Amino acid sequence: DLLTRYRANPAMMKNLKLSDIRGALLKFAKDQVGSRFIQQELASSKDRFEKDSIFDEVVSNADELVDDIFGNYVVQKFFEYGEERHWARLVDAIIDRVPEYAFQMYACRVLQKALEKINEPLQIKILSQIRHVIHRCMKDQNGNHVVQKAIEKVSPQYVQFIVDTLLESSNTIYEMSVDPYGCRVVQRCLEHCSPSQTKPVIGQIHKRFDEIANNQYGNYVVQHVIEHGSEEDRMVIVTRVSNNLFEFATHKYSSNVIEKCLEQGAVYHKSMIVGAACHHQEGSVPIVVQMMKDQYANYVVQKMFDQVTSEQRRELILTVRPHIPVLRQFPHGKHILAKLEKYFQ
RNA sequence: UGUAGAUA
Ligand SMILES: [Cl-]
């Protein structure tokens, strides 16, 4: 009834302390008002022993609190930097049900905060439970954040088991790249793993490149390869893009992949794309012109002009300079050449 | 004129 009292007149118990909660800790932590009370005390208190007073109750009730809408914040308090002395004890209170906690919307925030804060030995202890559920966890609306946090905050060698999951079967990298949650995992791996680790992952992506490039999620995976891959990877992608410039530029998702080449590419990469754009193609219109008539590829043409050298832009201008009035009437064509007005003055 | 993650 301490909670019921305190909820009634909060001002009347302005001298309430953490050490006063004792057995009431479970009831407080699962209450909107009471959990805000614990939290504000934990953050404002400068008494190490007041903070310690509730910790035995937090540990005793860990399982009931980690996935409570209000209690999860109370558990997270003991994973913060002022609480090292409690990390090992708190990890051990939750370690055995980590494989379930990773899928739960409140408990997974506790796992993310622990990985965010605790030392590498304890991280590895937590990862050892993730091992059991890792493939399903990567695709999960909750679990993918726990995996993303592991990749960002643990040294590369201790997440090799996550890379071998991305590589467990022929189709796994495709399956993850096209998944709305698994694709974030591929992306962090590209950002944080060693080249030893990323090289097979990028190799797998390349095998089904066209598909992944035009997927509503895979196109970000390909964009991360462009940004974080090797020179040789960029050349493979630019070479594929250049040789199918029209197909890539006219589809919704893959058109962002060309734009990404045009941003992260060296002068000689851009020259391959400008060259394909301006190629004769026998009697048909040059690809750059056709692209300007397209709903997605006109943004690609605009990005070409913004990113290439003056010498490269000169070839685009000498290729588009006849076909203009035709383009003026085409759907939104008035707008498209308006934005290119600068370069035709 | 065109794309993306779970807390009071
Ligand atoms: Cl394969």
Rounded distance in angstroms from the CA atom of residue A8 to the C1' atom of nucleotide B5: 39
Asked whether the CA dihedral A197, A199, A202, A203 is positive or negative, the reply is negative
Rounded Cα distance, A334 and A7, in Å: 65
Contact A127, A154 (CB under 8 A): yes
Residue A118: φ, ψ to 5°:
-85, 170
Q: Which residues touch strand B (CB under 7 A)?
A: A 32, 35-36, 39, 69-70, 72-73, 76, 105-106, 108-109, 112-113, 141-142, 144-145, 148, 180-181, 183-184, 187, 216-217, 219-220, 223, 252-253, 255-256, 259, 295-296, 298-300, 302, 332, 335-336, 339
Rounded Cα distance, A95 and A165, in Å: 22
Quote the ligand 1 centre to A206 CA distance (angstroms): 10
Domain A1-344 top-level CATH class: mainly alpha
Rounded distance in angstroms from the CA atom of residue A172 to the C1' atom of nucleotide B7: 30
Contacts of A119 (CB under 8 A, 6+ apart): A84, A87
Question: Within 10 A of A111 (CB to CB), how many other CB atoms are there?
Answer: 26
Rounded Cα distance, A297 and A308, in Å: 17
Contacts of A289 (CB under 8 A, 6+ apart): A319, A320, A323, A327
User: Closest residue to B6 by CA to C1' distance?
Assistant: A142
- Closest nucleotide to A184 by C1' from CA: B5
Contacts of A108 (CB under 8 A, 6+ apart): A101, A102, A142, A143, A145, A146
Rounded distance in angstroms from the CA atom of residue A316 to the C1' atom of nucleotide B5: 39
Half-sphere exposure of A330 (CA within 13 A, CB side): 17
- Closest nucleotide to A260 by C1' from CA: B3
Cα angle A292, A298, A304; round to 5: 100
Query: Entry resolution in angstroms?
Result: 2.5
Rounded Cα distance, A129 and A267, in Å: 47
Which residue, among A106, A155, A105, A103, has the nearest Cα to A129 in the 3D structure? A103
Quote the ligand 1 centre to A203 CA distance (angstroms): 9
- How does A51-75 read in b/e, with b if 16+ C-beta sit within 10 Å? bebbbebbbebbeebbbbebbbbbb
- Closest nucleotide to A39 by C1' from CA: B8
Rounded Cα distance, A85 and A49, in Å: 12
* Residue A157: Cβ-neighbour burial (10 angstroms; 0-12, 13-18, 19+): exposed
| Measured CA distances, A326 to A115, A289, A333 (Å) | 59, 10, 9
Contact A301, A291 (CB under 8 A): yes
Rounded distance in angstroms from the CA atom of residue A219 to the C1' atom of nucleotide B5: 16
Contacts of A220 (CB under 8 A, 6+ apart): A183, A187
Q: Which residue has the tokens 């965010």?
A: A116
Nucleotides of B under 7 A from a protein CB: 1-8
Question: Within 10 A of A120 (CB to CB), how many other CB atoms are there?
Answer: 11
Phi-psi region of A282 (alpha: psi -120 to 50; beta: other; left: phi over 0): left
Q: Which residue has the tokens 């001298």?
A: A15
